[PDB]
């Protein structure tokens, strides 16, 4: 028998001790090696109680990704306004596993269409999660895992427009971002196949209808707020990219290549909440990153319970929701 508990987890990874990349460096001294023979025990006739929006596992990943960025990504000016060293780095996230110490176990929901909250019929017990890459981004969830069957709408409270929505895709759409080798060093662009993106976006529209009484589904650009939230921001090879996602939410098409205009920025608002700092100028050459879009962060407009329209805008900024989208199927329990 077991009870719900919060505990201190430990991480594991396949960090190459030989490597210079900051995530390997970090994982080398912070995580143990992954179990080469991991076990998973199906619990027969067991139904358990999950809640992705209240899982302590998410607060502990957050704490780790902070520690990683604070030792890896050093700005040149920070805080008492300090000026320090900010050397260009090798940067490419690696998968991190989370594991329970003695006397505890992780329970896993295997229901193909589990939404992140409620009971789950097909449960197993494992010692570690799967490998999760700590990808920090807004608007679009990159390089995650995909839903196994249908698209999944996740939200702490659908009818409450203040709660963020996580759309979990079942089909990946590549986004391909380049700061060309050669001139404005800060100009970049992301290409997305519009045929692939618009088909999937229309699948989310029809999915959102099941949950919003077949009311009309409308997308719009974010009304305002932080640059970090009104644009798709993320880190590619150590450079901070800020991309304009207007064309991604073009209701007109719900057929060609979509090119988003992007800006590499040096003055950032730290998602760690540590303020505004200045990073180093970009490395020379073709800065390129190809990522899989595997989810979308949305906020529904308020004040439309009168109309038969429902508007959604790509949002985010709470980086913990990025960790939730991968830990939603797990929860820690204590064994007596
Ligand atoms: N301007 C306000 C400032 N916002 C941020 O720091 C912020 C949010 C999201 C990202 C972000 C996301 C990314 F994906 C990437 Cl790549 C990135 F580089 C940055 N940054 C805040 N300061 C406080 C302290 O009271 C706040 C309340 O908690 S919000
Ligand atoms: N106390 C609030 C906290 N203060 C700072 O961050 C801060 C003070 C001075 C500098 C500074 C000075 C420089 F000369 C250079 Cl070059 C630089 F890079 C940074 N930064 C903030 N947090 C957020 C959102 O995260 C803010 C909105 O920007 S202000
Ligand atoms: C339960 O989950 C396991 C692990 O993914 C899967 O192989 C199996 O098909 C599932 N069975 C049922 C009845 O849900
Ligand atoms: C998830 O499923 C539970 C159990 O049926 C339900 O109570 C909850 O409203 C669902 N949430 C969403 C966002 O569909
Ligand atoms: C994704 O899910 C939708 C339902 O939300 C379904 O119609 C579609 O066929 C699925 N696509 C794939 C590739 O599984
Ligand atoms: C969800 O939101 C609605 C509307 O904001 C509210 O009436 C309801 O109480 C909320 N549910 C919970 C469990 O807080
Ligand atoms: C990504 O786009 C660049 C152009 O910026 C192109 O050279 C490259 O072949 C693309 N990669 C993939 C995998 O499509
Ligand atoms: C875009 O995706 C469609 C499939 O939806 C494919 O048939 C087409 O060749 C793709 N085009 C490009 C330029 O990637
Ligand atoms: C994003 O692109 C649209 C279309 O060109 C433009 O109107 C808007 O001002 C851009 N947003 C920002 C923040 O530059
Ligand atoms: C996503 O994964 C690809 C493939 O490993 C990698 O090349 C790319 O840099 C990753 N993107 C981000 C933003 O981490």
The residue whose CA has the least distance to atom 11 of ligand 6 is 157
Is 320:57 a contact under the CB 8 Å cutoff? Answer: no
Is 101:8 a contact under the CB 8 Å cutoff? Answer: yes
* Cα gap 136→252, rounded to integer Å: 30
Sign of CA dihedral 28, 65, 268, 188: positive
Counting from 1 in the atom list of ligand 3, the atom nearest the Cα of 121 is 14
Q: Per-residue DSSP letters for 172-198?
A: EEEEEEEE-----TTEEEEEEEHHHHH
* Cα gap 165→89, rounded to integer Å: 34
Alpha helices in the chain (DSSP H): 22-30, 56-72, 194-211, 227-230, 320-327
Q: How many CB atoms lie within 10 A of CB 264?
A: 19
- 101 burial type by CB count under 10 A (0-12 exposed, 13-18 middle, 19+ buried): exposed
3-class DSSP assignment, residue 328: coil
Resolution rounded to one decimal, in angstroms: 2.1
Q: Locate tokens 């060093």: which residue? A: 185
250, containing H or E segment: none
Distance in angstroms between the alpha carbons of the first and the last residue of the chain: 6
The domain 2-335 is classified under which CATH number: 3.10.105.10, 2.60.120.260, 3.20.20.80, 2.170.40.20? 2.170.40.20
Is 121:58 a contact under the CB 8 Å cutoff? Answer: no
The residue ranges of every structural domain in the chain are: 2-335
HSE (side-chain half, CA atoms, 13 Å) at 59: 8
Pocket of ligand 1 (CB under 6 A): 136-138, 226, 228, 233-235, 240, 268-271, 273, 317
Is 310:208 a contact under the CB 8 Å cutoff? Answer: yes
**Residue 253 is encoded by which pair of tokens?**
């098409």
* Cα gap 198→215, rounded to integer Å: 20
* Cα gap 221→326, rounded to integer Å: 26
Task: Check residue 284 and report its DSSP letter.
Answer: S
Gap positions in the chain, given as the residue before each gap (C–N > 2.5 A)? 79, 182, 254
The residue whose CA has the least distance to atom 1 of ligand 10 is 291
Rounded to the nearest angstrom, the distance between the alpha carbon of 296 and the centre of ligand 3 is: 27
Phi, psi of 60 (to 5 degrees): -80, -35
Rounded to the nearest angstrom, the distance between the alpha carbon of 228 and the centre of ligand 1 is: 7
């Amino acid at each position: 028998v077991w009870k719900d508990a919060d505990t201190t987890l430990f991480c594991a990874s396949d960090a190459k001790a030989h490597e210079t990349e900051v995530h390997n460096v970090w994982a080398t001294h912070a995580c143990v090696p992954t179990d080469p023979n991991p076990q998973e025990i199906h619990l027969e006739n067991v139904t358990e109680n999950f809640n992705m929006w209240k899982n302590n596992m998410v607060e502990q990943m957050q704490e780790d990704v902070i520690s990683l960025w604070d030792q890896s990504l050093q700005p040149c000016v920070k805080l008492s306004v300090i000026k320090q060293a900010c050397p260009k780095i090798s940067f490419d996230p690696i998968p991190i596993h989370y594991c329970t110490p003695a006397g505890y176990v992780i329970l896993k929901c295997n229901d193909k269409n589990f939404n992140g909250t409620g009971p789950c019929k097909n449960v197993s017990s494992v010692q570690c999660t799967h490998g999760i890459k700590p990808v920090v981004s807004t608007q679009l969830l990159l390089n995650g895992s995909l839903a196994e069957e249908e698209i999944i709408i996740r939200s702490e409270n659908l009818t409450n427009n203040a709660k963020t929505i996580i759309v979990h895709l079942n089909k990946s759409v590549e986004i391909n971002c380049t700061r060309p080798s050669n001139g404005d060093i800060r100009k970049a662009y992301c290409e997305i196949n519009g045929t692939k993106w618009n088909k999937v976006l229309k699948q989310v529209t029809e999915k959102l209808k099941e949950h919003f009484n077949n009311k009309t589904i409308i997308f719009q650009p974010p009304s305002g707020g932080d640059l970090e939230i009104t644009m798709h921001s993320f880190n590619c090879r150590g450079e901070f990219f800020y991309c304009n996602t207007t064309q991604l939410f073009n209701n007109t098409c719900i057929n060609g290549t979509i090119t988003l205009p992007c800006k590499i920025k040096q003055i950032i608002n730290m998602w760690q909440g540590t303020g505004q700092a200045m990073y180093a100028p970009p490395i020379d050459g073709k800065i390129n990153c190809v990522s899989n879009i595997t989810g979308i962060l949305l906020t529904r407009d308020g004040g439309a319970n009168n109309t038969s329209n429902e508007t959604f805008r790509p949002g985010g900024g709470n980086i913990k929701d990025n960790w939730r989208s991968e830990l939603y199927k797990y929860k820690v329990v204590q064994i007596e």
